[PDB]
């Protein structure tokens, strides 16, 4: 490991890291300035506008880890593994909300059951953001006591403990977002299939970029768990030497995620 | 004689249009500002008016 | 016998015109050159008065300055306490495609109309605690586009029939029948003085129409494009027109000239709604870039604008005390402004 | 608080309003609305029977999509100003009367009926308020059409058509020829099917359409287009 | 309209009962309702209320708890459950409607009324003449006196008057003190000073005798005034 590589990819990764942190700047002005115009936004928009907030959350909780685990300056408070992880599940779970929107609001289900939970659903929305946050919270009390824990054995076992805390909490809402996405992408060709007779101009072409949004968020926010999976093990890689190449990979994925979602974030593009 | 007599009204229309005395415009403008700055103080939406007096606030 | 009569009228509209020319003695502008702007007008949204689940079309105020009528496509008529956001009654209109509506002043009555070609009269106090339709009064061959109570008996309906009724209520059948507009009528306000009203027709013209007599005193011919809303100067001896042709012309009845134009180079889009302040210093008007870009009626200068919808503002609506504006837009969404201090 | 007894039932007056405003709203959402357009000559009239003055409603459901059709020839205006009325629809139905390109109209018949079906969707499949609100063309008189097509050709409305007079082919110029109005193919679509009088598919061509449509529109707002 | 009720008659001391308050000619379900309690020869009072939909049930302390209040909205009738009745209940129960918007006029129709018999804080609102000589063409005016001042911040005072023409039920002659009811003849008026009241009449046909009561409605425990008495 030289120190030239070192510094290429830490300059990778800062890159990465204001990159992300002016996307979601941009997003946090943007729908502030649609709020105080309308105060009326589809639920869509505000999930845009959380998973905003939980970037910056997990963008800052990166930063700070960073530099105080490569230049260790007053490793007393700066180990905020709690915040990133904390702060890891509420975005896990916001994009599994995502994923439950698009399943919800596309697909031509009709039962009465299920078009009164969805009206209910765009009423409640943010009530059902504060109940992703509670579920986040509960998740993370697991969590917190192994830290805990471990924090007093500070000052295997309760270590294996946390590992699978940590574990189940982040990958519970990761099922849902693979589950919601692969039913989404069956709907979304097998609908193609046969809707080649009504007419192909337009919407043959708006199914296929739905399906490749579908296709880069799956491969961005799997890969990404994939990642923290890993990072989780922890022992098969090495988180001391190889650090800023797997904190730019990471977060690469984050930018990946972020400008999709940009991108795909229909307050903006009526603004803009 | 249809379109002979859509003429014919319209003729007539137009006659009794001849016969208004109009006003040359500047003192039906005269009159027009007068009025506008007669009740100007007694219009919040362009005045002010006190925090207290106004009903939707 | 076409020839000798058209030949005869362009003579007389020769001659109207010399006389419109030799009237203008001093252009408004010259006149308005010397006085004091306003300013930098500012208004707040003071409440949005939310609920109503569709596209607003029109709405209207109480002559107490304090309920207002607010027509969707949900079908729905709701009257709105304006001072506390309170849903007073909840109308539910036969034809859910609505255009114009409007508050009796004795608040008694609401009128309601559209696409329909009726106009429904809602009668407010009733015995029982539901509104119901008092007359559905009808004979319009032709959309109606504005109602404008007189005395809570008569009521003056515009109808794309290229027509302006003066329909009696308790007998439910129209009395006048204002005709001569070339093109439908999409704008109606009512004088103060309650003898005349001004129709702005799709001609590109507007017209003076007193209610008793029957005939049209004075036509004016302005906009290149059609006119799509009006409203009548708080004196009664002006009104004002604006058009999807995006100028807001003022006129006055002792002068047809058109008195004033405000239009600026950036503006394009068109004009849905105009109404005045009690002053008449204020033309408030909603146009199509989800604004309502307010025009000194003397000096010809932006003043102020009162952003805020995402939508066309269909009807703007002023107090009668001249202290708040409605600004119902197509944004579902009613908006109370009220300046400050 | 400085809320009295009238003010507190005054509001909840209004929450009862309210809650009566959003159950309409139960029933409204799950309604689709759809315009019926087109020249009053032929063809508007018959896809409402089809489908089983005053603005004409027309409640018709098909498996669990609700569609309220707008009937509207009988507004008699020439020139179209409450088409912002219904700025908001999901499905412009225009009915093309393609069967009488050898008919003329009878008040000036130097102006034909098929060019004033195209001026008609000109002005509506690029009207500045139907901008990606989208289209189903119906064809019309597909029979009479078909039976006429070798009798009188193309050419009397048509200075620039060529090719073969068969039906099969004719048809498809016109269609192409009516969707050539299109200024934008990716906002909105034209879709077509040519109708006749016992065709009993047209329900089905309808309900398959305003069905894409709403997928598309789901599609928007959820910000995958 | 009519909103003829029922029960009543003899009950044992400690026993119970049910009325029924059937409601015609007027929109039940956007009407909320009050019950009223006459004494055999006392003077009214507040028994309890339920607004449209039964959001808010209010009762009075002197029967809080003993009593229910209910309202059958599709049959529109209003269900009173009498549970441990005693001595001070034998009274001639009213049922009352009254609706609550802006320029609304509660309290505005009353019914029959029906009586029950059994055997063997708040504001105050009181009438002190409770007695007056009057004659025919004669202008009288009538002064309730209040504990504190009827008016709220928002410009309103909220003051009822009542006639209650004698063997008849009480008829709304002014709201808020300064609205006249519809249907009453133009001569009645009110006015007050913020906690003391005068209600005036100009001329007192044979049609205006009876007791006039007068009433708070700023807090819910509604309080009825002693009235007054028309003497000719
Ligand atoms: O280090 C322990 C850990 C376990 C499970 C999940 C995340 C973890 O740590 C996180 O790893 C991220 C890797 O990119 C870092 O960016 C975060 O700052 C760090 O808190």
């Not at chain 3, 252009?27 to 300013?39: A, F, R, Y």
């Not at chain 3, 909840?90 to 009726?118: E, Q």
């Not at chain 4, 193309?154 to 020829?177: D, F, K, M, V």
Request: hydrophobic share 40%; glycine share 6%.
């Amino acid at each position: 490991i030289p120190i030239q590589l070192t510094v290429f990819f830490m300059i990778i990764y800062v890159l990465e890291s204001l990159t992300i942190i002016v996307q979601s700047s941009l997003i946090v002005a943007v729908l502030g300035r649609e709020w105080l115009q309308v105060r009326r936004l589809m639920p869509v928009d505000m999930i845009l506008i959380s998973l905003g907030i939980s970037r910056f959350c997990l963008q800052w909780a990166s930063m700070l880890n960073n530099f105080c685990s490569y230049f260790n300056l007053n490793y007393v408070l700066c180990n905020l593994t709690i915040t990133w992880e904390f702060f890891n599940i509420l975005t896990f779970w916001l994009n599994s909300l995502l994923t439950v929107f698009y399943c919800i609001k596309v697909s031509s289900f009709t039962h009465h059951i299920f078009l009164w939970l969805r009206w209910r659903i765009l009423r409640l929305f943010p009530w059902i953001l504060l109940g992703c946050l509670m579920i986040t919270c509960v998740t993370i009390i697991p969590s917190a006591i192994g830290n805990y824990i471990q924090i007093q054995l500070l000052t295997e076992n309760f270590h294996q403990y946390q590992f699978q805390a940590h574990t189940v909490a982040l990958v519970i809402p990761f099922i849902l977002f693979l589950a919601s996405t692969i039913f989404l992408m069956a709907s979304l060709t097998k609908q193609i299939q046969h809707h080649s007779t009504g007419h192909c101009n337009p919407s043959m072409k708006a199914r296929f970029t739905a399906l490749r949004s579908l296709a880069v968020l799956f491969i961005v926010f799997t890969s990404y768990f994939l990642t923290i999976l890993i990072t989780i093990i922890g022992t098969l890689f090495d988180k001391r030497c190889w650090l800023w190449v797997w904190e730019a990979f990471v977060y690469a994925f984050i930018l990946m995620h972020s400008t999709s979602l940009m991108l795909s974030s229909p307050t903006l593009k009526r603004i803009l | 004689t249809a379109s002979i007599a859509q003429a014919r009204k319209l003729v007539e229309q137009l006659k009794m249009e001849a016969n208004i005395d109009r006003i040359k415009v500047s003192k039906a403008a005269a009159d027009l500002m007068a009025y506008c700055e007669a009740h100007a103080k007694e219009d919040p939406l362009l005045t002010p008016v006190p925090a207290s007096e106004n009903p939707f606030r | 016998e076409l020839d000798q009569l058209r030949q005869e009228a362009e003579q007389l509209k020769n001659q109207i015109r010399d006389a419109r020319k030799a009237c203008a003695d001093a252009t408004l502008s010259q006149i308005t050159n010397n006085i004091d702007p306003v300013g930098r007008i500012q208004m707040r949204t003071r409440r949005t008065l939310r609920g109503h689940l569709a596209k607003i079309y029109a709405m209207h105020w109480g002559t107490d300055s304090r309920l207002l009528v607010s027509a969707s496509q949900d079908g729905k008529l709701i009257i709105w306490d304006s001072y506390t956001t309170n849903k007073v009654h909840a109308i539910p209109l036969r034809s859910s495609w609505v255009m114009t509506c409007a508050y009796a002043p004795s608040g008694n009555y609401v009128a309601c109309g559209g696409l329909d070609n009726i106009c429904s009269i809602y009668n407010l106090k009733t015995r029982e605690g539901n509104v119901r339709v008092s007359r559905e009064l009808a004979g319009h061959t032709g959309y109606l586009s504005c109602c404008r109570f007189l005395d809570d008996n008569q009521i003056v309906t515009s109808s794309g029939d290229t027509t302006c009724a003066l329909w009696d209520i308790e007998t439910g059948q129209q009395t006048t029948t204002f005709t001569g507009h070339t093109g439908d009528v999409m704008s109606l306000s009512l004088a103060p003085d309650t003898r005349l009203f001004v129709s702005g027709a799709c001609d590109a013209s507007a017209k003076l129409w007193d209610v008793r007599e029957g005939m049209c005193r004075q036509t004016f011919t302005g906009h290149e494009s059609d006119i799509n809303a009006i409203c009548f100067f708080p004196n009664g001896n002006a009104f004002a027109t604006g058009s999807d042709d995006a100028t807001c012309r003022l006129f006055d009845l002792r002068a047809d000239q058109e008195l004033m134009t405000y239009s600026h180079d950036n503006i394009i889009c068109g004009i849905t709604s105009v109404s005045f302040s009690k002053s008449g210093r204020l033309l408030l008007a909603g146009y199509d870039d989800f604004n309502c870009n307010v025009w000194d009626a003397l000096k010809a200068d932006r003043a102020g604008v009162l952003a805020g919808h995402d939508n066309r503002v269909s009807c703007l609506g002023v107090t009668d005390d001249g202290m708040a504006v409605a600004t119902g837009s197509w944004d579902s969404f009613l908006k109370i402004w009220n300046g400050s201090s | 608080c400085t809320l009295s007894a009238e003010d507190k039932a005054a509001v909840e007056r209004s929450k009862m309003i309210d809650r009566n405003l959003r159950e309409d709203g139960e029933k409204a959402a799950r309604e689709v609305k759809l315009l019926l357009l087109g020249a009053g000559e032929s063809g508007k009239s018959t896809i409402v029977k089809q489908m089983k003055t005053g603005i004409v409603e027309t409640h018709f459901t098909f498996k669990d999509l609700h569609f309220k059709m707008f009937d509207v020839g009988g507004q008699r205006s020439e020139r179209k100003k409450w088409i912002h009325c219904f700025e908001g629809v999901t499905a412009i139905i225009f009915c093309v009367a393609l069967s009488d390109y050898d008919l003329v109209l009878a008040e000036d018949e130097e102006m034909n009926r098929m060019h004033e079906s195209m001026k008609l969707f000109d002005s509506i499949c690029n009207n500045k308020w139907f901008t990606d609100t989208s289209i189903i063309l119906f064809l019309n008189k597909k029979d009479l059409f078909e039976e006429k097509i070798k009798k009188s050709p193309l050419t009397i409305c048509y200075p620039e058509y060529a090719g073969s007079n068969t039906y099969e082919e004719a048809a498809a110029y016109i269609q192409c020829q009516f969707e050539d109005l299109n200024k934008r193919k990716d906002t909105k679509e034209i879709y077509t099917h040519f109708t006749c009088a016992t065709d009993t598919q047209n329900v089905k061509f309808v309900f398959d359409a305003v069905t894409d449509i709403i997928i598309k529109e789901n599609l928007k707002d959820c910000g995958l287009f | 309209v009519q909103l003829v009720e029922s029960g009543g008659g003899l009950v044992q001391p400690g026993g119970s009962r049910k009325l029924s308050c059937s409601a015609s000619g007027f929109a039940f379900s956007s009407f909320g309702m009050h019950w009223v309690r006459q004494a055999p020869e006392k003077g009214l009072e507040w028994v309890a209320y339920i607004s449209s939909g039964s959001g808010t049930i209010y009762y009075a302390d002197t029967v809080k708890g003993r009593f229910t209040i209910s309202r059958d909205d599709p049959k529109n009738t209003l269900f009173l459950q009498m549970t441990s009745l005693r001595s001070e209940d034998t009274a001639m129960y009213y049922c009352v409607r009254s609706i609550y918007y802006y320029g609304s006029s509660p309290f505005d129709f009353w019914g029959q009324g029906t009586t029950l018999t059994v055997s063997s804080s708040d504001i105050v609102m009181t009438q002190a003449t409770s007695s007056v000589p009057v004659t025919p063409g004669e202008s009288v005016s009538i002064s309730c006196r209040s504990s504190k001042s009827l008016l709220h911040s928002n410009g309103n005072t909220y003051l009822y008057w009542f006639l209650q023409r004698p063997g008849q039920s009480p008829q709304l002659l002014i709201y808020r003190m300064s609205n006249l009811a519809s249907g009453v003849p133009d001569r009645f008026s009110g006015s007050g000073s913020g906690t003391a009241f005068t209600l005036t009449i100009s001329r007192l046909e044979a049609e205006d005798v009876g007791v006039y009561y007068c009433m708070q409605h700023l807090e819910y425990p509604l309080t009825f005034g002693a009235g007054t008495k028309l003497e000719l």
